[PDB]
Design an enzyme around this catalytic site. Sequence first.
Site, PDB file in Angstrom:
ATOM      1  N   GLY A   1      -5.112   3.259  -3.478  1.00  0.00           N
ATOM      2  CA  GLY A   1      -4.671   3.010  -4.846  1.00  0.00           C
ATOM      3  C   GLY A   1      -4.975   4.175  -5.765  1.00  0.00           C
ATOM      4  CD  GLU A   2      -3.142   8.990  -6.544  1.00  0.00           C
ATOM      5  OE1 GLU A   2      -3.034   9.632  -7.614  1.00  0.00           O
ATOM      6  OE2 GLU A   2      -2.650   9.375  -5.457  1.00  0.00           O
TER       7      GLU A   2
ATOM      8  N   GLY B   1      -7.910   6.406 -12.457  1.00  0.00           N
ATOM      9  CA  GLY B   1      -8.746   6.108 -11.298  1.00  0.00           C
ATOM     10  C   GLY B   1      -8.037   6.261  -9.969  1.00  0.00           C
ATOM     11  CE  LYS B   2      -6.538  10.320  -5.169  1.00  0.00           C
ATOM     12  NZ  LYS B   2      -6.582  11.798  -4.999  1.00  0.00           N
TER      13      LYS B   2
ATOM     14  CG  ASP C   1      -6.576  -5.585 -15.000  1.00  0.00           C
ATOM     15  OD1 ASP C   1      -5.449  -6.156 -15.079  1.00  0.00           O
ATOM     16  OD2 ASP C   1      -6.733  -4.440 -14.516  1.00  0.00           O
TER      17      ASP C   1
HETATM   18  N1  LIG Z   1     -12.197  -2.556  -1.485  1.00  0.00           N
HETATM   19  C1  LIG Z   1     -10.894  -2.284  -1.355  1.00  0.00           C
HETATM   20  N2  LIG Z   1     -10.333  -2.355  -0.126  1.00  0.00           N
HETATM   21  C2  LIG Z   1      -9.023  -2.109   0.004  1.00  0.00           C
HETATM   22  N3  LIG Z   1      -8.133  -1.793  -0.940  1.00  0.00           N
HETATM   23  C3  LIG Z   1      -8.718  -1.715  -2.145  1.00  0.00           C
HETATM   24  C4  LIG Z   1     -10.056  -1.937  -2.434  1.00  0.00           C
HETATM   25  N4  LIG Z   1     -10.302  -1.764  -3.788  1.00  0.00           N
HETATM   26  C5  LIG Z   1      -9.129  -1.447  -4.278  1.00  0.00           C
HETATM   27  N5  LIG Z   1      -8.124  -1.398  -3.345  1.00  0.00           N
HETATM   28  C6  LIG Z   1      -6.707  -1.109  -3.575  1.00  0.00           C
HETATM   29  O1  LIG Z   1      -6.608  -0.153  -4.619  1.00  0.00           O
HETATM   30  C7  LIG Z   1      -5.884  -0.718  -5.737  1.00  0.00           C
HETATM   31  C8  LIG Z   1      -6.464  -0.180  -7.015  1.00  0.00           C
HETATM   32  O2  LIG Z   1      -7.857  -0.555  -7.080  1.00  0.00           O
HETATM   33  P1  LIG Z   1      -8.460  -0.993  -8.468  1.00  0.00           P
HETATM   34  O3  LIG Z   1      -9.925  -1.179  -8.374  1.00  0.00           O
HETATM   35  O4  LIG Z   1      -7.750  -2.284  -8.930  1.00  0.00           O
HETATM   36  O5  LIG Z   1      -8.136   0.214  -9.469  1.00  0.00           O
HETATM   37  P2  LIG Z   1      -7.413   0.285 -10.893  1.00  0.00           P
HETATM   38  O6  LIG Z   1      -8.472   0.060 -11.952  1.00  0.00           O
HETATM   39  O7  LIG Z   1      -6.789   1.656 -11.017  1.00  0.00           O
HETATM   40  O8  LIG Z   1      -6.308  -0.821 -11.007  1.00  0.00           O
HETATM   41  C9  LIG Z   1      -5.975  -2.229  -5.527  1.00  0.00           C
HETATM   42  O9  LIG Z   1      -4.955  -2.966  -6.202  1.00  0.00           O
HETATM   43  C10 LIG Z   1      -5.865  -2.321  -4.003  1.00  0.00           C
HETATM   44  O10 LIG Z   1      -4.514  -2.119  -3.599  1.00  0.00           O
HETATM   45 MG   LIG Z   2      -8.581  -1.600 -13.315  1.00  0.00          MG
HETATM   46 MG   LIG Z   3      -6.624  -2.801 -10.485  1.00  0.00          MG
END
Ligand SMILES: Nc1ncnc2c1ncn2[C@@H]1O[C@H](COP(=O)(O)OP(=O)(O)O)[C@@H](O)[C@H]1O
Ligand SMILES: [Mg+2]
Ligand SMILES: [Mg+2]
Length: 290
Positions: free
Chosen positions: A16-17, A21-22, A135
Amino acid sequence: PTVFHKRYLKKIRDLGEGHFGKVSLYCYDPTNDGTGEMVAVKALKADAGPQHRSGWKQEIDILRTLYHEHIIKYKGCCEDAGAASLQLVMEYVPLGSLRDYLPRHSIGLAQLLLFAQQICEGMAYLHAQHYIHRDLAARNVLLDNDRLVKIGDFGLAKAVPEGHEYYRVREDGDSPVFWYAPECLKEYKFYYASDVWSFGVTLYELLTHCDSSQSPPTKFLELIGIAQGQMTVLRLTELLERGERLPRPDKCPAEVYHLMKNCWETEASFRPTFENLIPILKTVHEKYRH
Ligand SMILES: Nc1ncnc2c1ncn2[C@@H]1O[C@H](COP(=O)(O)OP(=O)(O)O)[C@@H](O)[C@H]1O
Ligand SMILES: [Mg+2]
Ligand SMILES: [Mg+2]
């Protein structure tokens, strides 16, 4: 408290990006044999300003204090010298978010109701810890296995001071407006009940299998129109105040849609709390299971 050395972190792929954040998948292999654990590492882009940096510090601080079977597991932090801040190391959930998983896997109604019950359990725990998520969406609900869900992304999470019923935030471009209650949109006040509204929207996403053509932005924008200048949020607030809501998903039982509508009460105090939802969803899942 745990410290992960950058020295043994091997990037596998992005998960995710992007702005700001990433989330990436790494293998943390100190022995350099390949038996090392797979971890999801969230990083703050080096370009990020003070507002997002103080917010990132808060996201790590919150996730570090949370411990629940329905909340993504914090493993530790890595020193991101290039950022220069901390990289958040968490457990990797192979199935990813419900937003990515559901459009590709036809899951039965009983299983979706189980996920919804587990989301409420994780959220009731969060609310008892005196925090608001802000969120709550299917993109932030991670799937560990076909029977287990975990809430992630505490980027907008806030501590609600004791004695206070809400937290006030400002006008922001990245605000997930299509998941927000009218009090958030009109008064910029976020109550514990405001997360319940977002859960009703998340429940709608699950019952639509996160189909893009049925998503909350798609449906609200078909109602609002796309030639409204700076007025999409105003038209959204107005349609919600008139009692217009997201439609009943195909195959959603009537009682489940009524539960959804109750999470969408305009009056925040008429909404059930996550604590009230738990026995209700346990009962509804039991009805639908076979
Ligand atoms: N622990 C994890 N394991 C697998 N995929 C993850 C995990 N954490 C995040 N992701 C993937 O990354 C995406 C973005 O993470 P997230 O924490 O929601 O960041 P953002 O604040 O940019 O939305 C998630 O919607 C999911 O697809
Ligand atoms: Mg977020
Ligand atoms: Mg998110």
